[PDB]
C-alpha cells in the first residue's frame, strides 16, 4: 500500500527529477581539449624514442634484447661494426601498427636506449608514416629528451 501510494503520486519520477536537477547545477569535470589535457604519470607508455648519452653518443649497442622480448615482433634490427669499431645498429625499425605499447622493450633494454615517451598525439594520414626507422626514432629522442630524462628520474626508485 505504501509503495502503491508513492507510485500513484509519481514519487519515483519526482526523485529522479530532483536528482537530475542536482546534477544539472553541479560542476562539470569536462576537459576543454585541446587547451586542457588529461593527467599523465611518469610511467605513461607513449610514442617510442631512441635516446643518446649526455656525451651525445647513441645509447643503443645493438644487443637485440628489445627485438627478442617484443611480444608483437614489432622491432627489426641489423647491426655491423661501425667505422670506428663500435657496436651499433644500421637498421632499427619499429612497426607502430604491430606494436602493442606494452613497454617490454624499455624494460629489456640494458642501457635505456629505447623508451616509450610521453607523446601520444601523432596520428597520421597515411599508414606508412607509422613505420618508424632509426632516424625517426632518434629524432624523437632528441626532441623529447628533456621530458624523458625527467620521467626516468621520477620513476627510477621503482625500477
Amino acid at each position: 500500500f505504501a509503495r502503491a501510494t508513492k507510485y500513484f503520486l509519481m514519487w519515483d519520477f519526482i526523485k529522479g527529477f530532483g536528482l537530475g536537477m542536482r546534477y544539472f547545477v553541479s560542476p562539470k569535470p569536462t576537459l576543454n581539449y585541446p587547451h586542457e589535457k588529461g593527467p599523465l604519470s611518469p610511467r605513461f607508455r607513449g610514442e617510442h624514442a631512441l635516446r643518446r648519452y649526455p656525451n651525445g653518443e647513441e645509447r643503443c649497442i645493438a644487443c637485440k634484447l628489445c627485438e627478442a622480448v617484443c611480444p608483437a615482433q614489432a622491432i627489426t634490427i641489423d647491426a655491423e661494426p661501425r667505422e670506428d669499431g663500435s657496436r651499433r645498429t644500421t637498421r632499427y625499425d619499429i612497426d607502430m601498427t604491430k606494436c602493442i605499447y606494452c613497454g617490454f622493450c624499455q624494460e629489456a633494454c640494458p642501457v635505456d636506449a629505447i623508451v616509450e615517451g610521453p607523446n601520444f598525439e601523432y596520428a597520421t594520414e597515411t599508414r606508412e608514416e607509422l613505420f618508424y626507422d632509426k632516424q625517426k626514432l632518434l629524432a624523437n629522442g632528441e626532441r623529447w629528451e628533456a621530458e624523458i630524462a625527467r620521467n626516468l628520474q621520477l620513476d627510477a626508485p621503482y625500477r
Binding site: P34, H35, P42, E121, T126, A146, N151
Partner: protein
C-alpha cells in the same frame, strides 16, 4: 573579418566561450617561444594553454608538456628543464604536409632507396 573568425570557428586559438572562461578564471602562468600562453585555476588544479594561431595540440613543446599534463607540479618558468646541447627543437605533427616522415623506400620520397643484399658480377 577578425571577429567573425572568432565567432564562427573553433580551431583558431580559442572559441569565444573559452576566452570568456579564461578571463573569468584564468591566471597567467607563462609563455612559450611560439607565443602560446599558459593559465591555471586553483593554483594548478586546472591548467590550460591559449594557442597563438591554429589550436593544434601537438604544438605544445616538451618544455611545457609535463606541466600541462600534470606530470610535474611546477611550471617551467619556476623549474626549467635541463637540456643537453645535442637536443633538437620541438616540431608539431607534420602528417598532412610535405615535411611528414616517410620510410626511405616510400614512393613519396621521389628517390626511393634501392635495396639489395648481394653484389652482382659485371661483365668486362
Amino acid at each position: 573579418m577578425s571577429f567573425l573568425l572568432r565567432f564562427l570557428t573553433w580551431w583558431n586559438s580559442q572559441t569565444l566561450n573559452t576566452q570568456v572562461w579564461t578571463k573569468l578564471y584564468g591566471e597567467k602562468v607563462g609563455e612559450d617561444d611560439q607565443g602560446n600562453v599558459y593559465y591555471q585555476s586553483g593554483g594548478g588544479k586546472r591548467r590550460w594553454v591559449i594557442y597563438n594561431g591554429e589550436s593544434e595540440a601537438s604544438r605544445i613543446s616538451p618544455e611545457w608538456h609535463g606541466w600541462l599534463h600534470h606530470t610535474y607540479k611546477e611550471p617551467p618558468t619556476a623549474a626549467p628543464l635541463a637540456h643537453k646541447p645535442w637536443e633538437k627543437p620541438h616540431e608539431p605533427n607534420l602528417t598532412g604536409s610535405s615535411g611528414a616522415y616517410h620510410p626511405a623506400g616510400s614512393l613519396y620520397r621521389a628517390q626511393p632507396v634501392e635495396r639489395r643484399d648481394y653484389d652482382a658480377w659485371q661483365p668486362e
